[PDB]
Design a protein around this ligand. Structure first.
Ligand code: CLA
Ligand code: CLA
Ligand code: CLA
Ligand code: CLA
Ligand code: CLA
Ligand code: CLA
Ligand code: CLA
Ligand SMILES: CCCCCCCCCCCCCCCCCC(=O)OC[C@H](CO[C@@H]1O[C@H](CO)[C@H](O)[C@H](O)[C@H]1O)OC(=O)CCCCCCCCCCCCCCCCC
Ligand SMILES: C/C(C=C=C1C(C)(C)C[C@H](O)C[C@@]1(C)O)=C/C=C/C(C)=C/C=C/C=C(C)/C=C/C=C(/C=C/[C@@]12O[C@]1(C)C[C@@H](O)CC2(C)C)CO
Ligand SMILES: CC(/C=C/C=C(C)/C=C/[C@@]12O[C@]1(C)C[C@@H](O)CC2(C)C)=C\C=C\C=C(C)\C=C\C=C(C)\C=C\[C@@]12O[C@]1(C)C[C@@H](O)CC2(C)C
Lengths: 168, 177
């Protein structure tokens, strides 16, 4: 009762405390008719994709790969990269990863034990015990949400005003 | 048995004494509506939202007309017509404000319906007391009465300002003198 985020709204009844980044924020009750693991996986995937996208947009408006095709702004880079076939390679490998993801999310939903977003990818450690893993999961979630909103703002401002890196 | 405000009318059944500003002024018996998701809880929440919105709007009109606009913002003293001058030059501000108000209003409606269902939240309550001006009781009732009276007065005032600006196309205090 009385979820932490919205103090005047009831607790979403599906987010008690046992999830990283769980401040009880679900006013429209998306968790009431969708699996929690599915939504967590979707959120983490969005976080990672948008973090990579924000970093790439900002960097590519500064540094360009050698070649005349890579001499466009990130706003206009989509139509150039799709014509050159640059985005085709990313599409192919992302589709391979996403088919393996289809298998992984199916197994997670039907038992297994794989945590949402846990691909066990960890060449370095950066997370030795449970406490470090929880803290870094919270950091990843917060940074990913911030980067999703940041990429949203960057794209909207750049489309509104065709400016360089300062999209004001 | 008779309403305090209207002695020629019987006391409205649903308005005993609880809500701040209750004087029994329900001649049409609207407090007894229990259909289309509308009841005393919904009516009180709507009244409080109207009170707060009217207070904010009246304060904004008076502030802008007396102390002038903020730097970088248009002038004209007609608040119903300066809106189109702001939108003509800063449409993004208006759009962002509208989107924020839309999200907050969706949250407000969800909260109203939930609090009506599992009764734990008083109508118009959003737990918004950052400065702790209404922590203790015996002052909360007085603050509720002050808010309700000021909000009704500002509702009437803001409706008047809207109509005056739409019709006369002049400022509020311009109409005053
Ligand atoms: C969402 C991810 C994403 C997407 C869709 C793109 C898309 C694009 N980038 Mg880009 N970029 C990204 C992230 C991304 N970038 C990141 C994170 C960086 C920082 C290193 C850059 C740095 C960058 C530069 C410097 C340039 C581009 C350019 C371009 C355009 C054409 C060439 C190209 O594909 O990039 C080539 C990308 C690189 C050389 C660096 C990519 C490094 C990756 C993203 C990090 C490692 C992630 C890993 C491989 C994930 C594995 C995927 C899995 C399925 C196997 C194209 C529109 C070029 C352009 O035309 O600019 C307008 C260009 O000059 N990008
Ligand atoms: C702020 C950035 C950030 C942070 C803190 C994390 C944090 C984490 N990621 Mg992660 N990730 C990110 C961005 C980030 N991610 C992005 C942009 C991608 C897309 C390429 C991924 C893709 C990814 C995969 C595929 C996996 C993780 C995993 C993990 C966990 C263990 C690995 C680790 O300690 O990462 C350390 C990261 C940093 C110190 C960031 C600094 C890098 C410069 C941990 C919760 C693993 C997991 O789920 O474990 C539970 C896992 O399998 N991440
Ligand atoms: C992530 C946080 C973040 C931050 C720091 C900013 C920061 C800014 N935004 Mg912004 N914005 C964001 C998210 C953010 N935005 C999101 C999620 C959206 C919706 C997609 C927008 C939509 C938006 C619009 C439509 C406009 C800004 C504008 C601005 C600037 C005023 C300022 C630099 C304004 C600006 O200067 O654009 C040129 C403007 O007009 N933003
Ligand atoms: C665009 C997004 C949006 C959304 C989704 C909502 C959603 C809601 N608003 Mg709302 N509101 C918004 C924007 C929005 N608002 C804005 C921009 C303002 C002005 C700042 C308001 C001012 C406002 C007030 C003052 C009230 C609401 C109320 C409500 C709730 C009742 C909805 C209903 O049945 O109305 C149906 C829609 C109608 C237009 C019916 C109203 C018709 C009247 C008679 C018009 C009278 C005009 C005369 C001159 C609902 C949660 C009410 C509430 O919470 O009650 C509990 C309430 O009293 N809203
Ligand atoms: C119902 C509440 C309400 C509404 C809808 C508005 C609406 C508006 N005000 Mg405003 N205002 C209000 C209450 C309100 N005010 C109050 C209570 C005060 C006193 C603190 C002010 C003080 C004020 C000033 C000083 C100025 C405005 C201005 C504006 C206009 C552009 C700013 C904007 O988009 O607002 C959203 C802005 C933010 C969220 C920030 C817009 C028509 C500007 C304008 O163009 O006036 C002509 C301006 O200069 N207002
Ligand atoms: C005459 C002005 C006035 C007064 C006396 C109050 C009084 C009150 N408001 Mg309130 N309010 C007002 C204007 C006012 N409001 C306006 C214009 C808005 C719109 C922004 C709000 C939005 C608002 C919310 C969202 C909430 C309150 C709440 C409250 C109650 C507890 C907070 C408190 O002590 O505030 C004292 C206020 C002052 C001393 C005004 C000083 C200027 C209290 C009865 C809370 C409540 O009802 O809790 C049950 C609550 O959640 N108010
Ligand atoms: C809240 C209290 C309040 C106050 C102090 C005023 C005060 C005023 N109104 Mg007014 N008005 C109000 C509420 C109020 N109104 C309401 C609730 C509405 C309906 C929404 C109106 C609709 C209204 C109109 C349509 C007109 C006035 C006009 C006037 C002015 C002329 C007064 C008169 O007797 O002329 C007679 C005066 C400054 C008139 C004006 O501006 O004169 C030039 C005018 O045309 N008012
Ligand atoms: C606008 C569309 C109206 C939507 C109606 C929703 C509910 C309204 C309603 O049913 O109550 C309609 C209200 C409620 O009327 C009340 O009903 C109660 C029992 O339900 C009690 O009988 C009250 O005594 C009675 O007054 O009546 C009126 O407001 C009629 C006033 C008409 C004045 C014309 C001038
Ligand atoms: C279904 C729903 C929402 C909901 C729900 C949920 C989501 C299901 C959740 C719950 O469970 C139930 C329920 C029902 O709550 C309904 C949504 C509400 C609506 C339909 C929104 C309406 C808002 C309209 C407003 C507030 C417009 C005001 C216009 C003004 C104009 C201003 C002007 O300046 C302009 C522009 C020109 C100037 O010249 C002069 C004037 C004219 C003054 C003043 O502001
Ligand atoms: C800034 C913003 C969001 C900021 C979010 C932040 C900081 C989030 C922080 C967190 O996530 C972290 C970091 C960690 C989480 O655990 C906790 C929180 C705290 C939640 C959203 C802006 C959101 C801004 C929005 C939605 C603006 C919308 C504007 C519109 C629609 C206007 C459109 C128009 O103006 C045009 C474009 C042209 C005109 O011609 C037509 C019209 C329509 C007038």
């Amino acid at each position: 009762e009385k979820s932490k985020a919205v103090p005047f709204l009831p607790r979403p009844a599906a987010l008690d405390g046992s999830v990283v980044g769980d401040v009880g924020f679900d006013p429209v009750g998306f968790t009431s008719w969708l699996p929690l693991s599915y939504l967590q996986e979707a959120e983490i995937k969005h976080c990672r994709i948008a973090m990579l996208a924000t970093l790439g947009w900002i960097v590519a408006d500064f540094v360009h790969l050698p070649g005349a095709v890579h001499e466009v702004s990130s706003l206009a880079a989509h139509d150039v990269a799709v014509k050159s076939g640059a985005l085709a390679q990313i599409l192919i490998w992302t589709s391979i990863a996403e088919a393996i993801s289809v298998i992984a999310i199916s197994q997670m939903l039907e038992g297994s034990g794989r945590q949402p977003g846990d691909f066990k990818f960890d060449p370095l450690n950066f997370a030795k015990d449970e406490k470090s893993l929880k803290k870094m999961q919270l950091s990843e979630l917060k940074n990913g949400r911030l980067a999703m909103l940041a990429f949203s703002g960057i794209v909207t401002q750049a489309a509104l005003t065709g400016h360089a890196f300062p999209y004001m | 048995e008779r309403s305090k405000s209207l002695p020629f009318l019987m006391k409205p059944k649903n308005l005993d004494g609880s809500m701040a500003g209750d004087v029994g002024f329900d001649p049409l018996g609207l407090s007894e509506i229990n259909d289309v998701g509308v009841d005393l809880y919904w009516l009180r929440e709507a009244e409080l939202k109207h009170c707060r919105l009217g207070m904010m709007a009246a304060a904004g009109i008076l502030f802008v007309e007396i102390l002038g606009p903020a730097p970088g913002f248009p002038a004209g003293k007609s608040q119903m017509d300066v809106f189109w001058k702001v939108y003509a030059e800063k449409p993004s501000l208006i759009g962002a404000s509208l989107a924020a108000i839309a999200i907050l209003e969706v949250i407000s409606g969800v909260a109203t319906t939930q609090g009506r269902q599992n009764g734990d939240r008083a109508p118009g309550d959003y737990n918004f007391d950052p400065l702790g001006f209404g922590k203790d009781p015996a002052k909360f009732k007085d603050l509720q009465l002050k808010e309700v009276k000021n909000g009704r007065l500002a509702m009437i005032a803001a409706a008047g300002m809207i109509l005056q600006g739409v019709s006369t196309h002049q400022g509020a205090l311009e109409n005053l003198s």
